[PDB]
Structure 1
Amino acid sequence: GSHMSNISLIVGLGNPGSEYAQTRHNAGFWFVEQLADKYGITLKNDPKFHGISGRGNIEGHDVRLLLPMTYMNKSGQSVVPFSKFYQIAPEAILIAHDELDMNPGVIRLKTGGGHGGHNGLRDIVPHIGPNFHRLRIGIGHPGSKERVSGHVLGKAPSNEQSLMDGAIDHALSKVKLLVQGQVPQAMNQINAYKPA
């Protein structure tokens, strides 16, 4: 199983299919796909856990990566059995996701707290509780609840995409701290990011 708050499971939330790959709601997939390429972790088909998953070394630590293939609002149907099967406590889990309540180019590491309306996190917290770590990747808000679907299932304009991509790249450089259990230092250094 997991050990203390050494992060050993990194989840990216999103929807499957080419038609969703470039949409804001897949920010978590963007982060975990780029992390897997950085460290040479193979993301392979994982039908048992309704996902794509990998395992590999990050900076001397054995780490698992997970992308649910459930559709966003059913993400817990992947994350919960996967984390339970590998005996990974929530304290050792990082979930990367899009954050409506932050600007594009803002990124924050949060421990605990609610789903803030996020329909993927809404499917996870009832089962494992809130005490996992989250990489909140700012995507901006479209300005009414009725518009949230169209915004998160939209492809951001190039300036916003550039801002998100820079924040994501910054966060990739801080994963070494997280897998080492240095959550306070990682939180300080991630949350300090500015695009310009």
Structure 2
Amino acid sequence: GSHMSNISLIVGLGNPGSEYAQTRHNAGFWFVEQLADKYGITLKNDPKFHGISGRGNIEGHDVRLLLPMTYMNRSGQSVVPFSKFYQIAPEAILIAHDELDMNPGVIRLKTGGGHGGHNGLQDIVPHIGPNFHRLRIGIGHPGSKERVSGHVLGKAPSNEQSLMDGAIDHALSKVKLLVQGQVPQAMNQINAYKPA
């Protein structure tokens, strides 16, 4: 099982399918896929947990990676049984996801709190409670209350994608702190990020 606030499960939220891969709502998938490549962690089919998953060493720590393949609003149908099977407490889980309330190129590490309208997080907090960590990857907001679907299922313009990709690359360099349980320092150094 997990140990204290050393992060040992990193989840990335998104939808399956090439048609959603480049959309804002898959920001969490981008981060976990990039982290997997960085550390040479294989993401392999995991039918038992309705996902794609991997396990590997990050900076001397055994860490599991999970991409639910449930569709975003059913993400809990992968995250919850996976974390239960492996006896991973919420305190040791990092969930990376798109954040409408932050600009592209803003990234913040948060512990606790609600789903903030995110339909993936909405499917997870009722089960495991809120005390997991979140890598909130700004995607910016749409022009109103009803363009939300269209915005999260859109592919960002290149300037915004460049800002998100630089923020995501920064965060990758801070995962060493998270897997070592240095959450306060990783929150300091992630939240300080600026694009330019």
Q: TM-score, normalised by structure 1?
A: 1.00
What is the aligned partner in structure 1 of residue 162 from structure 2? 162
Cα drift, residue 69 of structure 1: 0.1
Q: CA-to-partner distance for each residue in 1:56-90, whole Å, 9 max, x for gaps?
A: 00000000000000000000000000000000000
Q: CA-to-partner distance for each residue in 1:87-107, whole Å, 9 max, x for gaps?
A: 000000000000000000000
Cα drift, residue 143 of structure 1: 2.5
Q: Does residue 95 in structure 1 map to residue 81 in structure 2?
A: no
- C-alpha separation in 2, matches of 1:194 and 1:101: 16
Runs of 4+ in 1 over 3 A off after TM superposition: none
- C-alpha separation in 1, matches of 2:145 and 2:119: 13
Query: What percentage of aligned pairs have identical amino acids?
Result: 99
Cα drift, residue 144 of structure 1: 1.9
Q: CA-to-partner distance for each residue in 1:142-172, whole Å, 9 max, x for gaps?
A: 0322110000000000000000000000000
Unaligned runs of 5+ in 2: none
Secondary structure at the aligned position of 2:10 is classed as strand
- C-alpha separation in 2, matches of 1:165 and 1:107: 11
Secondary structure at the aligned position of 2:146 is classed as helix
Cα drift, residue 42 of structure 1: 0.0
RMSD (CA atoms): 0.3
Cα drift, residue 50 of structure 1: 0.2
Secondary structure at the aligned position of 2:18 is classed as coil
Cα drift, residue 140 of structure 1: 0.5
Matches within 5 A, 1:71-150: 71-150=71-150
Q: CA-to-partner distance for each residue in 1:28-77, whole Å, 9 max, x for gaps?
A: 00000000000000000000000000000000000000000000000000
Task: State which drifts further: 131-140 or 142-151.
Answer: 142-151
What is the aligned partner in structure 1 of residue 28 from structure 2? 28
- C-alpha separation in 2, matches of 1:159 and 1:147: 20
Secondary structure at the aligned position of 1:65 is classed as strand
The total of aligned residue pairs comes to: 196
Unaligned runs of 5+ in 1: none
Q: CA-to-partner distance for each residue in 1:102-126, whole Å, 9 max, x for gaps?
A: 0000000000000000000000000
- C-alpha separation in 2, matches of 1:112 and 1:150: 27
Secondary structure at the aligned position of 1:101 is classed as coil
- C-alpha separation in 1, matches of 2:143 and 2:156: 15
- C-alpha separation in 2, matches of 1:148 and 1:68: 22
Secondary structure at the aligned position of 2:78 is classed as helix
